Amino acid sequence: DVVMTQIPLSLPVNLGDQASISCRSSQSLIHSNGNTYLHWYLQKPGQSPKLLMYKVSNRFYGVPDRFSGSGSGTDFTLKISRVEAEDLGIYFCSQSSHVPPTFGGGTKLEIKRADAAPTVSIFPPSSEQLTSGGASVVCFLNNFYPKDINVKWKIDGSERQNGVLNSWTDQDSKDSTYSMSSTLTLTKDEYERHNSYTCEATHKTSTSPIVKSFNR
Amino acid sequence: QIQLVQSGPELKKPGETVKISCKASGYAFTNYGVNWVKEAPGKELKWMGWINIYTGEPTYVDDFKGRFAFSLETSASTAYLEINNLKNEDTATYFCTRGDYVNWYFDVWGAGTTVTVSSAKTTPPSVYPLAPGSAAQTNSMVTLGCLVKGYFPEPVTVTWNSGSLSSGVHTFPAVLQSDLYTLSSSVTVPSSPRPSETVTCNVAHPASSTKVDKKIVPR
Numbered sequence: 001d002v003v004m005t006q007i008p009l010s011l012p013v014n015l016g017d018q019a020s021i022s023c024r025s026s027q028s029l030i031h032s033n034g035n036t037y038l039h040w041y042l043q044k045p046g047q048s049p050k051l052l053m054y055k056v057s058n059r060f061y062g063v064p065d066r067f068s069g070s071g072s073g074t075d076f077t078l079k080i081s082r083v084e085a086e087d088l089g090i091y092f093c094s095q096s097s098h099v100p101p102t103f104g105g106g107t108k109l110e111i112k113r114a115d116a117a118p119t120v121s122i123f124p125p126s127s128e129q130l131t132s133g134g135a136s137v138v139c140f141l142n143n144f145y146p147k148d149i150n151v152k153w154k155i156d157g158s159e160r161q162n163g164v165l166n167s168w169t170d171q172d173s174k175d176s177t178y179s180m181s182s183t184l185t186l187t188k189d190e191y192e193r194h195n196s197y198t199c200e201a202t203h204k205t206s207t208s209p210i211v212k213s214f215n216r
Numbered sequence: 217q218i219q220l221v222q223s224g225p226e227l228k229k230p231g232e233t234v235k236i237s238c239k240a241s242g243y244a245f246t247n248y249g250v251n252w253v254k255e256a257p258g259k260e261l262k263w264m265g266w267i268n269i270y271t272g273e274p275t276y277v278d279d280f281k282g283r284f285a286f287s288l289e290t291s292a293s294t295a296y297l298e299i300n301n302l303k304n305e306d307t308a309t310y311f312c313t314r315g316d317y318v319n320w321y322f323d324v325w326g327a328g329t330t331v332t333v334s335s336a337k338t339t340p341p342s343v344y345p346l347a348p349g350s351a352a353q354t355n356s357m358v359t360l361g362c363l364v365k366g367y368f369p370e371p372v373t374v375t376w377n378s379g380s381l382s383s384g385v386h387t388f389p390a391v392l393q394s395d396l397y398t399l400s401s402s403v404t405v406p407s408s409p410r411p412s413e414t415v416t417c418n419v420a421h422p423a424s425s426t427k428v429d430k431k432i433v434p435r
């Protein structure tokens with residue numbers, strides 16, 4: 001498998017600007033008769049991939065005239081000239097120069113915006129999840145940019161690890177932010193054998209963590 | 217509309233079998249290859265193998281040999297992929313793509329078929345409310361939430377006040393904890409709308425025929 005690699009995972013881009021993406025191969029891509037089968041797909045959200053550029057530099061029918069291609073042998077690069085709003089999606093690169101065709105992980109165009117920090121909010125269990133046994137404490141680390149943020153769950157000073165399952169939201173199309181949430185799922189006697197519950201998140205914006213809490 | 221048009225979503229338990237059709241329309245079916253590509257959840261877009269309509273013999277990447285099989289009925293312009301003794305890792309979207317003989321790319325892609333392999337039985341969600349226990353104003357905006365835990369299958373739908381509140385609503389992706397799914401939604405209102413005005417959390421689970429309205433009551 002000719003490991004195909006692409007960086008960056010996510011490329012913030014102010015629309016109007018120009019984006020350039022790159023891809024690299026765990027072998028060389030000149031086929032055994034001077035042809036280079038490196039092709040790039042665009043996958044818009046919960047839709048299909050669709051050929052944009054083949055044989056390194058040729059543009060698929062209809063594909064808009066600001067897209068470009070270049071690269072030799074092992075480093076290829078796609079370039080978009082004035083990225084318009086509907087060039088946004090996961091750009092993948094593939095090779096069918098060696099058996100078997102392989103795909104690289106893709107790089108997503110994302111809109112850029114000034115930073116913000118998560119409005120965190122922290123919720124204890126409700127009487128009604130308690131009258132039957134579990135207790136899911138739930139923190140909402142809402143409305144932040146950039147995507148990396150990390151949550152830690154401090155339980156009575158100590159830390160907890162089994163119980164977190166986090167889940168992330170797609171870049172909100174109204175203010176380009178992200179949101180994330182972790183619900184610590186404890187049983188009702190794990191929850192009632194503790195008292196201080198604090199949710200904690202270090203995001204790029206504050207050096208200090210943006211902790212929040214309730215005291216059981 | 218030269219398209220390859222595929223079957224619908226499949227929900228299978230372990231050990232079962234699924235057969236995906238891919239109808240080609242608009243083009244000379246013998247003139248291309250049909251390739252099958254697997255898109256697995258936050259794994260790579262993976263190439264499964266290929267079918268050559270002139271001979272009729274497939275080719276398979278090692279990784280899907282044996283248990284995956286590709287059949288064909290070239291009179292009826294339909295291509296096929298059959299999965300037998302469905303394991304749990306086969307949950308992914310499988311796509312068929314027409315590849316070309318001169319320039320070797322894959323230019324028309326079907327819309328993909330979603331198989332979901334699981335052991336769960338339908339379960340209506342438990343819906344619980346999330347009100348902030350006198351967790352005072354950090355700054356004049358309360359964010360409440362709903363937590364819908366333990367359900368199968370996807371989907372559920374959350375709305376707040378029957379869709380009359382949507383600018384402050386975030387609903388987070390499902391994450392299955394132990395076969396069943398879990399999901400939460402938060403609304404952020406001004407502090408004078410709630411608790412003066414009510415805020416209700418409405419979740420519907422089409423597969424089980426269950427709609428639950430929860431009111432967020434101060435605490």
Ligand SMILES: C[C@]12CC[C@@H](O)C[C@H]1CC[C@@H]1[C@@H]2CC[C@]2(C)C(=O)CC[C@@H]12
Pocket residue numbers: 096097098099100101248249250251266275314315316317320321322
């Ligand atoms: C690269 C590879 C890869 C598989 C190998 O068996 C044949 C070669 C050459 C022809 C290609 C094929 C991939 C699938 C293609 C692109 C088709 O669908 C028709 C021509 C095919």
